[PDB]
Design a protein around this ligand. Structure first.
Ligand SMILES: CC(=O)N[C@H]1[C@@H](OP(=O)(O)O)O[C@H](CO)[C@@H](O)[C@@H]1O
Ligand SMILES: O=C(c1ccco1)N1CCNCC1
Ligand SMILES: Cn1ncc(Br)c1N
Ligand SMILES: Cn1ncc(Br)c1N
Ligand SMILES: Cn1ncc(Br)c1N
Ligand SMILES: [Cl-]
Length: 471
């Protein structure tokens, strides 16, 4: 970096009212100086000022989704369920189905040292969430072959952040990709935005480093372009994508019912919900806003809409379609990302951000929250999508949604509720297949059963819970 170049960038920053990021250049090594220059060269402080301004100095008709845009597996015609299952498996067997795992979370409520997908919830197998998910992919590729007599590939695109990327890659490598082919698993990274003081100023982590944070799960779309992942999908002939969150231990990865349902309705986007468990559950609610499909995040909803009651049913929530972060896209939808990625709004959250005191140089952790994180949300493409190209499908919580949000000891959405849900699931499947569990719960490996099939061999047999059915 020359003097002219360093000076021209300084000017940009100074003119933008962000000159303080250069206030310790005085006392910097030649390479700490380049760390600062290179990182500042990758932000436009004017767009930073623009974001900071909408966030800090900021400027609906609201009904349930109409029944044309909604379905449920709890009351679908069984002929439909069967047809959707079959079509989903055929699309898997045609190598047209990809999976995008959103694993860009630091997992702050869980306070673990490792990525959340590495977490062992205490199952007898001691498998991670990542491994459980990989094995569902493996098992579904096998089920697909049973009706093609040919290999079935579901590529697995794993989206991480700066914080999770390296440990995620090491973990996958140390487990030999959980038995999948390395060449059908791509680990990529979401982008970042700088953290912002309450007063609009870029926070500095050190005297040579801007404080940045992941740009939210809504960062998926831009990261699909710049990572090369969308191009890999085009190359492989992918036409259908299942996107989910890593923290859900029950997630039906590439669920064939979901895929076949969406593909046969020819939507651009579909999404899963469950019945909200109470007014206060920390879930987005899917609904119709200003004529369009939309989500209100739990952090942005008002008490009155969260607590509104169904007129005919005075104890049931009016808005109870809980977002479980299981989305479908057509590949064609991803072909349009350049035209609307930029229109995704920035959600704001107050944060305690450790930084350099501006003036002192003192690398302090703050008492009250001293700034803000900006995040895009994955579901903010929903109102971009016509009702007729959108579908929402209700599923059963007990089979499809068990999130790991909190640490052992919390009492909900934690490792013990997760463990209990998998093992309770496994016992239900066995009991349906004819087995007898003595006693709690049973862990069924995904390689044995994806979704409750293949357990005939257990008919008549007694199983002493807790148990583990594997190879
Ligand atoms: C932007 C986004 O994906 N938000 C999701 C996500 O919330 P968290 O901020 O990750 O707790 O998971 C919830 C399900 O556990 C879902 O209800 C919500 O809408
Ligand atoms: O409110 C926020 C938020 C907005 C911006 C950064 O974090 N969240 C609440 C739940 N969804 C994701 C994070
Ligand atoms: C009729 N309705 N509203 C939310 C949800 Br779930 C359902 N099934
Ligand atoms: C093809 N296309 N263009 C804009 C949007 Br939204 C979509 N889905
Ligand atoms: C009223 N509503 N919203 C999502 C879903 Br399934 C339903 N039924
Ligand atoms: Cl669309």
């Amino acid at each position: 970096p020359s003097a002219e170049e360093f000076q021209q960038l300084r000017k940009k920053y100074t003119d933008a009212g962000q000159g303080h990021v250069f206030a310790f250049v005085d006392e910097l090594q030649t390479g700490e100086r380049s760390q600062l220059f290179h990182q500042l060269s990758s932000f436009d402080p004017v767009r930073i000022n623009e974001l900071a301004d909408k966030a800090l100095n900021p400027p609906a008709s609201l009904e349930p989704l109409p029944d044309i845009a909604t379905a449920s597996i709890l009351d679908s015609d069984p002929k439909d369920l069967e047809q959707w299952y079959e079509e989903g498996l055929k699309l898997v067997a045609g190598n047209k189905v990809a999976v995008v795992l959103m694993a860009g979370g630091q997992g702050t409520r869980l306070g673990s040292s490792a990525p959340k997908g590495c977490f062992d919830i205490g199952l007898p197998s001691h498998k991670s969430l990542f491994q459980i998910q990989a094995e569902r992919i493996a098992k579904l590729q096998l089920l697909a072959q049973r009706i093609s007599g040919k290999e079935a590939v579901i590529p697995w695109y794993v989206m991480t952040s700066g914080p999770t990327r390296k440990p995620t890659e090491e973990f996958f490598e140390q487990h030999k990709y959980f038995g999948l082919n390395k060449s059908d698993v791509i680990i990529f990274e979401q982008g970042v935005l700088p953290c912002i003081s309450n007063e609009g100023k870029i926070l500095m982590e050190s005297k040579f480093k801007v404080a940045v944070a992941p740009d939210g799960n809504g960062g998926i779309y831009q990261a699909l372009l710049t990572s090369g992942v969308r191009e890999d999908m085009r190359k492989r002939g992918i036409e259908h994508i299942h996107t989910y969150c890593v923290d859900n231990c029950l997630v039906k990865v590439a669920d064939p019912v979901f895929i076949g349902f969406a593909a046969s309705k020819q939507v651009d986007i579909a999404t899963k919900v469950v019945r909200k468990r109470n007014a206060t559950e920390s879930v987005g609610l899917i609904l119709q806003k200003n004529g369009k499909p939309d989500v209100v995040e739990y952090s942005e909803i008002d008490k009155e809409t969260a607590e509104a009651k169904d007129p005919k049913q005075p104890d049931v929530l009016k808005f109870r379609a809980a977002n479980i972060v299981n989305h479908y896209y057509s590949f064609k939808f991803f072909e349009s990302i350049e035209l609307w990625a930029h229109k995704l709004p920035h959600h704001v959250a107050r944060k305690k951000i450790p930084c350099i005191k501006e003036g002192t140089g003192e690398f302090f952790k703050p008492e009250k929250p001293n700034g803000i994180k900006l995040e895009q949300f994955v579901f903010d493409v929903f109102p971009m999508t016509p009702l007729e190209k959108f579908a929402c499908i209700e599923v059963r919580r007990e089979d499809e949604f068990s999130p790991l949000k909190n640490a052992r000891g919390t009492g909900e959405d934690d490792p013990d509720t997760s463990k209990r849900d998998i093992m309770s699931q496994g016992q239900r499947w066995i009991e349906k297949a004819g087995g007898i569990v003595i006693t709690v719960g049973v862990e069924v490996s995904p390689l044995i059963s994806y979704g409750g099939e293949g357990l005939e061999f257990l008919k008549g047999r007694e199983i002493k819970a807790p148990a583990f059915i594997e190879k």
